[PDB]
Amino acid sequence: GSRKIIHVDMDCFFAAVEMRDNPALRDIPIAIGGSRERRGVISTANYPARKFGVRSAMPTGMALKLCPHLTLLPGRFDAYKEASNHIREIFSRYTSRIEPLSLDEAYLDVTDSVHCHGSATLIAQEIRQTIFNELQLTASAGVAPVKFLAKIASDMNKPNGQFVITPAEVPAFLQTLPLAKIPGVGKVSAAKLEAMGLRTCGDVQKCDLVMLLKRFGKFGRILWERSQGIDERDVNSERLRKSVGVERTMAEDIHHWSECEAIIERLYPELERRLAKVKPDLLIARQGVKLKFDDFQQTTQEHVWPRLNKADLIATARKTWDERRGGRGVRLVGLHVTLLDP
DNA sequence: TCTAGGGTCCTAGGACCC
DNA sequence: GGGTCCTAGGACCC
Ligand SMILES: Cc1cn([C@H]2C[C@H](O)[C@@H](COP(=O)(O)OP(=O)(O)OP(=O)(O)O)O2)c(=O)[nH]c1=O
Ligand SMILES: [Mg+2]
Ligand SMILES: [Mg+2]
């Protein structure tokens, strides 16, 4: 009863799009990210920049210290959305069982597909070739019987390559697979697991489920499952967005309420425009604000509210400012909405 | 080096309901 | 006491 799941993942997505649209960037180190003066981080980097150690989520000041000639780009999100829509239309040529996880990646369930003699290996190759033929961008892919193995597999032969895990190969693959490779196991969880002597799925296989359930809750069940190749999550295709948020980090911290309110005045019409694209009457379930301080602690306060309203967001930010700020600088202000449950 | 902005999901205490 | 909604925080992902 094995499913065939493909995970398709665009190579250096934002940067690949910028290089196609400006071939002068093809061989120099480039990254999409905010300037050091805007206190930015790297969204992504091309392979010439990665060679220096430049990575996603790296602070831009660190990226430039590693790669002084890094060319920093602002990002063209409509260009990326356009490429995303196109590759999702290419996925639809092969199956309707498509769960996009972000602009540049998706799960495909091709169990019931009849496109390349039921070969998921060849469907993945054909999708990657079509994407290259029609978008001049490359993609990598992973093929496995379950979601998480497919997603791990798509990383192992990038860029512009794929990797297939058959059911026969799953036990040997798992034995030495680091836990940190499992989606959902991040730095904090991996360090906790490491401090129990648990580094790989093989380690977790020698663990008692009751033990993991005590020390991790529902996460310990997931750890126990994945360590055996168990991942029953179905490819959905029905997921909908639940929130809309708009936030900005200032180049310098602000110390005065007048400055905070001015920022909100600039953020609010952007939040309204994005909400209106999906709910034109602006009806919502909750709205709220976010402050982040110069020491990097952050607070959110949100509440039931029927319709996007600027003055209530200002009032709420003023309460949060007055109450939970303690003379610190503020580096970030954000606005937030929770969408109604349709 | 000095730490984004777009999000999802889980936890957990108290309110509230029965 | 058992279920369920509000809310803040935080790990995590892209
Ligand atoms: C991981 C990450 C990605 N992104 C954006 C930029 C990425 O190009 C896009 C998709 O992310 P990824 O697929 O994680 O990264 P990538 O495509 O650039 O690199 P890879 O070739 O390894 O797949 O999302 C961020 O803005 N911040 C992040 O921390
Ligand atoms: Mg990618
Ligand atoms: Mg991706």
Tab-separated table of N, CA and C in Angstrom, chain A residues 194-331:
chain	number	residue	atom	x	y	z
A	194	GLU	N	19.866	15.939	21.393
A	194	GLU	CA	21.293	15.643	21.516
A	194	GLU	C	21.696	15.445	22.973
A	195	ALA	N	21.119	16.229	23.883
A	195	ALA	CA	21.485	16.105	25.288
A	195	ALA	C	20.890	14.866	25.941
A	196	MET	N	20.035	14.132	25.238
A	196	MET	CA	19.602	12.808	25.652
A	196	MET	C	20.369	11.710	24.933
A	197	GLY	N	21.407	12.064	24.174
A	197	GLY	CA	22.096	11.087	23.355
A	197	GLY	C	21.339	10.631	22.128
A	198	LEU	N	20.397	11.426	21.636
A	198	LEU	CA	19.595	11.070	20.469
A	198	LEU	C	19.991	12.011	19.338
A	199	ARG	N	20.704	11.483	18.350
A	199	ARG	CA	21.167	12.266	17.216
A	199	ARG	C	20.530	11.844	15.908
A	200	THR	N	20.275	10.555	15.723
A	200	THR	CA	19.770	10.020	14.469
A	200	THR	C	18.460	9.285	14.701
A	201	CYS	N	17.787	8.960	13.593
A	201	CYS	CA	16.564	8.162	13.690
A	201	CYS	C	16.852	6.781	14.252
A	202	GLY	N	18.015	6.208	13.920
A	202	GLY	CA	18.422	4.956	14.537
A	202	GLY	C	18.434	5.020	16.052
A	203	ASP	N	18.973	6.108	16.611
A	203	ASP	CA	18.890	6.337	18.054
A	203	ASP	C	17.447	6.310	18.548
A	204	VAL	N	16.552	7.018	17.857
A	204	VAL	CA	15.184	7.135	18.351
A	204	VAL	C	14.453	5.812	18.198
A	205	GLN	N	14.845	5.000	17.216
A	205	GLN	CA	14.258	3.673	17.076
A	205	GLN	C	14.479	2.819	18.312
A	206	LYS	N	15.564	3.050	19.043
A	206	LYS	CA	15.838	2.302	20.262
A	206	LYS	C	15.195	2.939	21.492
A	207	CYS	N	14.199	3.805	21.293
A	207	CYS	CA	13.523	4.528	22.360
A	207	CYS	C	12.100	4.024	22.533
A	208	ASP	N	11.592	4.183	23.752
A	208	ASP	CA	10.229	3.810	24.089
A	208	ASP	C	9.297	4.977	23.798
A	209	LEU	N	8.187	4.683	23.118
A	209	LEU	CA	7.219	5.723	22.785
A	209	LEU	C	6.687	6.416	24.036
A	210	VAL	N	6.455	5.662	25.115
A	210	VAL	CA	5.899	6.273	26.321
A	210	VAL	C	6.864	7.312	26.870
A	211	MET	N	8.154	6.996	26.834
A	211	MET	CA	9.180	7.935	27.264
A	211	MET	C	9.104	9.230	26.463
A	212	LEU	N	9.067	9.117	25.133
A	212	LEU	CA	9.054	10.305	24.286
A	212	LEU	C	7.781	11.116	24.481
A	213	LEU	N	6.648	10.438	24.690
A	213	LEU	CA	5.391	11.148	24.907
A	213	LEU	C	5.440	11.971	26.186
A	214	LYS	N	6.091	11.450	27.228
A	214	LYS	CA	6.224	12.222	28.458
A	214	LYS	C	7.089	13.458	28.244
A	215	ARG	N	8.276	13.278	27.662
A	215	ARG	CA	9.252	14.360	27.563
A	215	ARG	C	9.001	15.317	26.406
A	216	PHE	N	8.089	15.001	25.489
A	216	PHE	CA	7.867	15.876	24.342
A	216	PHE	C	6.412	16.070	23.965
A	217	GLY	N	5.464	15.359	24.582
A	217	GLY	CA	4.078	15.476	24.162
A	217	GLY	C	3.876	14.944	22.754
A	218	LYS	N	2.936	15.567	22.033
A	218	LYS	CA	2.596	15.105	20.689
A	218	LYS	C	3.800	15.134	19.764
A	219	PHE	N	4.776	15.991	20.058
A	219	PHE	CA	6.000	16.029	19.268
A	219	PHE	C	6.789	14.734	19.406
A	220	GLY	N	6.751	14.116	20.589
A	220	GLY	CA	7.448	12.859	20.788
A	220	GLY	C	6.831	11.715	20.003
A	221	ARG	N	5.509	11.736	19.821
A	221	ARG	CA	4.888	10.771	18.917
A	221	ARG	C	5.374	10.978	17.486
A	222	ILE	N	5.457	12.236	17.045
A	222	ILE	CA	5.928	12.518	15.689
A	222	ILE	C	7.373	12.047	15.512
A	223	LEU	N	8.247	12.381	16.463
A	223	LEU	CA	9.629	11.887	16.435
A	223	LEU	C	9.671	10.368	16.309
A	224	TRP	N	8.897	9.682	17.144
A	224	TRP	CA	8.896	8.226	17.128
A	224	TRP	C	8.433	7.691	15.774
A	225	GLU	N	7.357	8.261	15.231
A	225	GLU	CA	6.867	7.852	13.918
A	225	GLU	C	7.920	8.065	12.836
A	226	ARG	N	8.365	9.313	12.660
A	226	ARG	CA	9.287	9.633	11.573
A	226	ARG	C	10.546	8.782	11.642
A	227	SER	N	10.998	8.466	12.852
A	227	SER	CA	12.197	7.650	12.980
A	227	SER	C	12.007	6.255	12.419
A	228	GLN	N	10.776	5.864	12.109
A	228	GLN	CA	10.516	4.573	11.497
A	228	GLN	C	10.070	4.693	10.056
A	229	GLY	N	10.137	5.887	9.474
A	229	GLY	CA	9.583	6.088	8.157
A	229	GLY	C	8.079	6.270	8.134
A	230	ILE	N	7.435	6.405	9.293
A	230	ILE	CA	5.978	6.507	9.359
A	230	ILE	C	5.587	7.966	9.202
A	231	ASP	N	4.763	8.246	8.197
A	231	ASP	CA	4.296	9.606	7.933
A	231	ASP	C	3.024	9.463	7.101
A	232	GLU	N	1.893	9.392	7.799
A	232	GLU	CA	0.618	9.147	7.148
A	232	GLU	C	-0.033	10.414	6.621
A	233	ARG	N	0.580	11.581	6.837
A	233	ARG	CA	-0.034	12.825	6.400
A	233	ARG	C	-0.344	12.771	4.912
A	234	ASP	N	-1.592	13.040	4.573
A	234	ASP	CA	-2.023	13.037	3.185
A	234	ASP	C	-1.643	14.355	2.519
A	235	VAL	N	-1.406	14.297	1.210
A	235	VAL	CA	-1.235	15.509	0.413
A	235	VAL	C	-2.579	16.226	0.370
A	236	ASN	N	-2.615	17.457	0.872
A	236	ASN	CA	-3.926	18.035	1.154
A	236	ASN	C	-4.587	18.607	-0.097
A	237	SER	N	-4.151	19.788	-0.522
A	237	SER	CA	-4.606	20.595	-1.679
A	237	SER	C	-5.752	21.545	-1.325
A	238	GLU	N	-6.270	21.518	-0.091
A	238	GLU	CA	-7.405	22.345	0.333
A	238	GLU	C	-7.030	23.417	1.357
A	239	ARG	N	-5.748	23.584	1.662
A	239	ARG	CA	-5.359	24.505	2.723
A	239	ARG	C	-5.589	25.951	2.315
A	240	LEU	N	-5.967	26.776	3.301
A	240	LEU	CA	-6.234	28.195	3.114
A	240	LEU	C	-5.469	29.020	4.148
A	241	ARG	N	-5.083	30.219	3.740
A	241	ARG	CA	-4.389	31.168	4.607
A	241	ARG	C	-5.285	31.624	5.759
A	242	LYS	N	-4.705	31.742	6.965
A	242	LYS	CA	-5.467	32.056	8.178
A	242	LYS	C	-5.182	33.425	8.781
A	243	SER	N	-4.129	34.109	8.357
A	243	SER	CA	-3.745	35.382	8.946
A	243	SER	C	-3.098	36.226	7.869
A	244	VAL	N	-3.044	37.522	8.146
A	244	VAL	CA	-2.334	38.496	7.334
A	244	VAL	C	-1.600	39.417	8.297
A	245	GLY	N	-0.311	39.619	8.080
A	245	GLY	CA	0.472	40.477	8.946
A	245	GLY	C	1.353	41.393	8.127
A	246	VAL	N	1.607	42.578	8.682
A	246	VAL	CA	2.454	43.594	8.055
A	246	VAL	C	3.314	44.195	9.157
A	247	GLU	N	4.630	44.020	9.058
A	247	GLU	CA	5.515	44.548	10.083
A	247	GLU	C	6.760	45.130	9.435
A	248	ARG	N	7.427	46.043	10.160
A	248	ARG	CA	8.657	46.655	9.675
A	248	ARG	C	9.648	46.831	10.812
A	249	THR	N	10.899	46.513	10.530
A	249	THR	CA	12.011	46.845	11.410
A	249	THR	C	12.623	48.156	10.927
A	250	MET	N	12.735	49.123	11.829
A	250	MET	CA	13.345	50.411	11.514
A	250	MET	C	14.870	50.343	11.507
A	251	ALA	N	15.473	51.238	10.711
A	251	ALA	CA	16.931	51.313	10.617
A	251	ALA	C	17.545	51.709	11.946
A	252	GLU	N	16.877	52.591	12.680
A	252	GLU	CA	17.249	52.952	14.037
A	252	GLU	C	16.070	52.658	14.948
A	253	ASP	N	16.357	52.247	16.182
A	253	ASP	CA	15.279	52.058	17.139
A	253	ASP	C	14.561	53.377	17.371
A	254	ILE	N	13.272	53.285	17.656
A	254	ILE	CA	12.477	54.454	17.998
A	254	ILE	C	12.260	54.466	19.498
A	255	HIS	N	12.133	55.673	20.052
A	255	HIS	CA	12.000	55.834	21.485
A	255	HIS	C	10.793	56.659	21.880
A	256	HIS	N	9.998	57.130	20.919
A	256	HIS	CA	8.911	58.057	21.194
A	256	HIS	C	7.629	57.542	20.567
A	257	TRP	N	6.522	57.693	21.299
A	257	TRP	CA	5.240	57.221	20.784
A	257	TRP	C	4.900	57.870	19.447
A	258	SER	N	5.204	59.161	19.281
A	258	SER	CA	4.930	59.814	18.002
A	258	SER	C	5.571	59.050	16.850
A	259	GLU	N	6.792	58.537	17.061
A	259	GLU	CA	7.443	57.747	16.020
A	259	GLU	C	6.709	56.435	15.777
A	260	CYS	N	6.224	55.799	16.841
A	260	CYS	CA	5.526	54.530	16.671
A	260	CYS	C	4.249	54.720	15.867
A	261	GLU	N	3.465	55.740	16.227
A	261	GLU	CA	2.209	56.021	15.540
A	261	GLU	C	2.431	56.374	14.076
A	262	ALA	N	3.530	57.075	13.769
A	262	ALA	CA	3.846	57.397	12.380
A	262	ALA	C	4.101	56.136	11.569
A	263	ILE	N	4.831	55.177	12.155
A	263	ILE	CA	5.079	53.888	11.509
A	263	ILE	C	3.763	53.179	11.211
A	264	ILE	N	2.885	53.105	12.217
A	264	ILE	CA	1.575	52.481	12.029
A	264	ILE	C	0.802	53.143	10.891
A	265	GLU	N	0.818	54.482	10.828
A	265	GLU	CA	0.153	55.168	9.724
A	265	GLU	C	0.665	54.696	8.365
A	266	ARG	N	1.942	54.310	8.271
A	266	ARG	CA	2.447	53.797	7.003
A	266	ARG	C	2.105	52.322	6.801
A	267	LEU	N	2.046	51.539	7.887
A	267	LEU	CA	1.768	50.108	7.762
A	267	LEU	C	0.305	49.849	7.442
A	268	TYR	N	-0.594	50.633	8.029
A	268	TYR	CA	-2.014	50.303	7.933
A	268	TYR	C	-2.528	50.206	6.499
A	269	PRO	N	-2.308	51.182	5.614
A	269	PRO	CA	-2.851	51.028	4.255
A	269	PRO	C	-2.275	49.819	3.515
A	270	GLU	N	-1.060	49.373	3.848
A	270	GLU	CA	-0.553	48.137	3.246
A	270	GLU	C	-1.322	46.922	3.750
A	271	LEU	N	-1.619	46.879	5.049
A	271	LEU	CA	-2.431	45.789	5.577
A	271	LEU	C	-3.826	45.788	4.953
A	272	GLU	N	-4.443	46.966	4.826
A	272	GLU	CA	-5.765	47.051	4.209
A	272	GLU	C	-5.759	46.544	2.768
A	273	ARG	N	-4.737	46.904	1.991
A	273	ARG	CA	-4.677	46.489	0.595
A	273	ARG	C	-4.528	44.980	0.472
A	274	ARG	N	-3.738	44.372	1.345
A	274	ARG	CA	-3.545	42.934	1.259
A	274	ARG	C	-4.760	42.176	1.768
A	275	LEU	N	-5.385	42.653	2.843
A	275	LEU	CA	-6.618	42.025	3.304
A	275	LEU	C	-7.692	42.107	2.229
A	276	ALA	N	-7.842	43.287	1.623
A	276	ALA	CA	-8.895	43.494	0.631
A	276	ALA	C	-8.749	42.566	-0.571
A	277	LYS	N	-7.520	42.154	-0.911
A	277	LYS	CA	-7.356	41.210	-2.015
A	277	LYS	C	-8.078	39.897	-1.749
A	278	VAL	N	-8.149	39.476	-0.487
A	278	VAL	CA	-8.756	38.206	-0.127
A	278	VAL	C	-10.119	38.373	0.551
A	279	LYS	N	-10.386	39.520	1.175
A	279	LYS	CA	-11.684	39.799	1.793
A	279	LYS	C	-12.011	41.262	1.535
A	280	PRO	N	-12.674	41.558	0.415
A	280	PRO	CA	-12.888	42.968	0.036
A	280	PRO	C	-13.689	43.782	1.041
A	281	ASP	N	-14.603	43.163	1.785
A	281	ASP	CA	-15.383	43.880	2.785
A	281	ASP	C	-14.633	44.068	4.102
A	282	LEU	N	-13.391	43.574	4.190
A	282	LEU	CA	-12.465	43.742	5.319
A	282	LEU	C	-12.940	43.074	6.603
A	283	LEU	N	-13.886	42.146	6.516
A	283	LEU	CA	-14.393	41.481	7.707
A	283	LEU	C	-13.397	40.435	8.172
A	284	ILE	N	-13.137	40.399	9.477
A	284	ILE	CA	-12.059	39.594	10.037
A	284	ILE	C	-12.518	39.023	11.364
A	285	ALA	N	-11.695	38.150	11.937
A	285	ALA	CA	-12.026	37.611	13.250
A	285	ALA	C	-11.293	38.315	14.377
A	286	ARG	N	-10.036	38.706	14.161
A	286	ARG	CA	-9.241	39.377	15.177
A	286	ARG	C	-8.279	40.333	14.487
A	287	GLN	N	-7.840	41.352	15.217
A	287	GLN	CA	-6.739	42.184	14.748
A	287	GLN	C	-5.858	42.537	15.941
A	288	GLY	N	-4.601	42.863	15.653
A	288	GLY	CA	-3.673	43.090	16.743
A	288	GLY	C	-2.385	43.725	16.267
A	289	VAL	N	-1.476	43.903	17.220
A	289	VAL	CA	-0.242	44.617	16.954
A	289	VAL	C	0.904	43.820	17.553
A	290	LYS	N	2.106	44.166	17.114
A	290	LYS	CA	3.326	43.512	17.558
A	290	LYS	C	4.346	44.602	17.825
A	291	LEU	N	5.042	44.506	18.950
A	291	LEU	CA	6.212	45.337	19.191
A	291	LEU	C	7.400	44.439	19.434
A	292	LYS	N	8.540	44.797	18.853
A	292	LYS	CA	9.789	44.116	19.191
A	292	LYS	C	10.816	45.125	19.677
A	293	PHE	N	11.437	44.810	20.804
A	293	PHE	CA	12.286	45.748	21.514
A	293	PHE	C	13.753	45.576	21.125
A	294	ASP	N	14.578	46.527	21.579
A	294	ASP	CA	15.991	46.536	21.213
A	294	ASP	C	16.749	45.327	21.756
A	295	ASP	N	16.245	44.677	22.814
A	295	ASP	CA	16.839	43.441	23.314
A	295	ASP	C	16.249	42.189	22.672
A	296	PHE	N	15.340	42.341	21.716
A	296	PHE	CA	14.761	41.291	20.877
A	296	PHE	C	13.617	40.515	21.519
A	297	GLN	N	13.199	40.830	22.740
A	297	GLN	CA	11.928	40.315	23.227
A	297	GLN	C	10.802	40.953	22.420
A	298	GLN	N	9.750	40.193	22.164
A	298	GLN	CA	8.618	40.731	21.427
A	298	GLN	C	7.312	40.357	22.112
A	299	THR	N	6.298	41.203	21.914
A	299	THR	CA	4.974	40.977	22.464
A	299	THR	C	3.945	41.252	21.375
A	300	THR	N	2.872	40.484	21.414
A	300	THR	CA	1.734	40.659	20.527
A	300	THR	C	0.497	40.860	21.393
A	301	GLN	N	-0.394	41.768	20.997
A	301	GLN	CA	-1.717	41.743	21.613
A	301	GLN	C	-2.773	41.983	20.557
A	302	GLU	N	-3.709	41.060	20.541
A	302	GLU	CA	-4.712	40.891	19.513
A	302	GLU	C	-6.006	40.546	20.221
A	303	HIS	N	-7.117	40.821	19.555
A	303	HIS	CA	-8.406	40.592	20.176
A	303	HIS	C	-9.453	40.441	19.087
A	304	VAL	N	-10.537	39.763	19.450
A	304	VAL	CA	-11.754	39.712	18.651
A	304	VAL	C	-12.097	41.107	18.147
A	305	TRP	N	-12.310	41.231	16.834
A	305	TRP	CA	-12.663	42.510	16.234
A	305	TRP	C	-13.294	42.189	14.894
A	306	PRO	N	-14.358	42.854	14.518
A	306	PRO	CA	-15.131	42.398	13.361
A	306	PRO	C	-14.639	42.905	12.014
A	307	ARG	N	-13.879	44.004	11.960
A	307	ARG	CA	-13.545	44.619	10.674
A	307	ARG	C	-12.314	45.493	10.843
A	308	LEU	N	-11.373	45.356	9.915
A	308	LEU	CA	-10.108	46.066	9.990
A	308	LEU	C	-10.330	47.529	10.354
A	309	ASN	N	-9.633	47.993	11.390
A	309	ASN	CA	-9.885	49.333	11.908
A	309	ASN	C	-8.583	49.960	12.382
A	310	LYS	N	-8.196	51.079	11.760
A	310	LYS	CA	-6.889	51.681	12.029
A	310	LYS	C	-6.812	52.253	13.438
A	311	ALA	N	-7.850	52.970	13.879
A	311	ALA	CA	-7.781	53.644	15.175
A	311	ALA	C	-7.669	52.643	16.320
A	312	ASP	N	-8.385	51.519	16.223
A	312	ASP	CA	-8.253	50.502	17.259
A	312	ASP	C	-6.846	49.896	17.269
A	313	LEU	N	-6.203	49.764	16.104
A	313	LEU	CA	-4.833	49.255	16.110
A	313	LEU	C	-3.881	50.270	16.733
A	314	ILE	N	-4.068	51.564	16.436
A	314	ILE	CA	-3.259	52.593	17.096
A	314	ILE	C	-3.475	52.564	18.609
A	315	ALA	N	-4.741	52.521	19.035
A	315	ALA	CA	-5.045	52.480	20.461
A	315	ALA	C	-4.389	51.281	21.122
A	316	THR	N	-4.463	50.118	20.470
A	316	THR	CA	-3.870	48.911	21.038
A	316	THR	C	-2.352	49.030	21.105
A	317	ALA	N	-1.731	49.543	20.043
A	317	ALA	CA	-0.286	49.775	20.086
A	317	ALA	C	0.100	50.761	21.193
A	318	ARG	N	-0.751	51.759	21.465
A	318	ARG	CA	-0.461	52.726	22.523
A	318	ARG	C	-0.489	52.068	23.901
A	319	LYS	N	-1.495	51.229	24.151
A	319	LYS	CA	-1.555	50.451	25.386
A	319	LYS	C	-0.320	49.567	25.541
A	320	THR	N	0.045	48.832	24.474
A	320	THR	CA	1.226	47.969	24.526
A	320	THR	C	2.486	48.798	24.755
A	321	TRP	N	2.605	49.918	24.043
A	321	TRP	CA	3.736	50.822	24.216
A	321	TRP	C	3.834	51.297	25.655
A	322	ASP	N	2.759	51.902	26.159
A	322	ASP	CA	2.775	52.406	27.528
A	322	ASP	C	3.084	51.293	28.522
A	323	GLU	N	2.503	50.112	28.329
A	323	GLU	CA	2.487	49.141	29.422
A	323	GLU	C	3.707	48.231	29.464
A	324	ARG	N	4.216	47.789	28.331
A	324	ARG	CA	5.144	46.673	28.360
A	324	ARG	C	6.419	47.004	27.603
A	325	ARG	N	6.863	48.247	27.702
A	325	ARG	CA	8.021	48.721	26.960
A	325	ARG	C	9.200	49.148	27.830
A	326	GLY	N	8.948	49.716	29.006
A	326	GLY	CA	9.987	49.981	29.985
A	326	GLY	C	11.203	50.744	29.488
A	327	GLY	N	10.975	51.845	28.788
A	327	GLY	CA	12.061	52.674	28.302
A	327	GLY	C	13.020	52.051	27.305
A	328	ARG	N	12.710	50.865	26.777
A	328	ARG	CA	13.576	50.267	25.770
A	328	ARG	C	13.320	50.886	24.402
A	329	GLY	N	14.334	50.821	23.545
A	329	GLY	CA	14.108	51.105	22.140
A	329	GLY	C	13.215	50.057	21.500
A	330	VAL	N	12.482	50.477	20.479
A	330	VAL	CA	11.652	49.569	19.701
A	330	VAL	C	12.273	49.448	18.319
A	331	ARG	N	12.591	48.216	17.917
A	331	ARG	CA	13.128	47.998	16.586
A	331	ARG	C	12.059	47.613	15.572
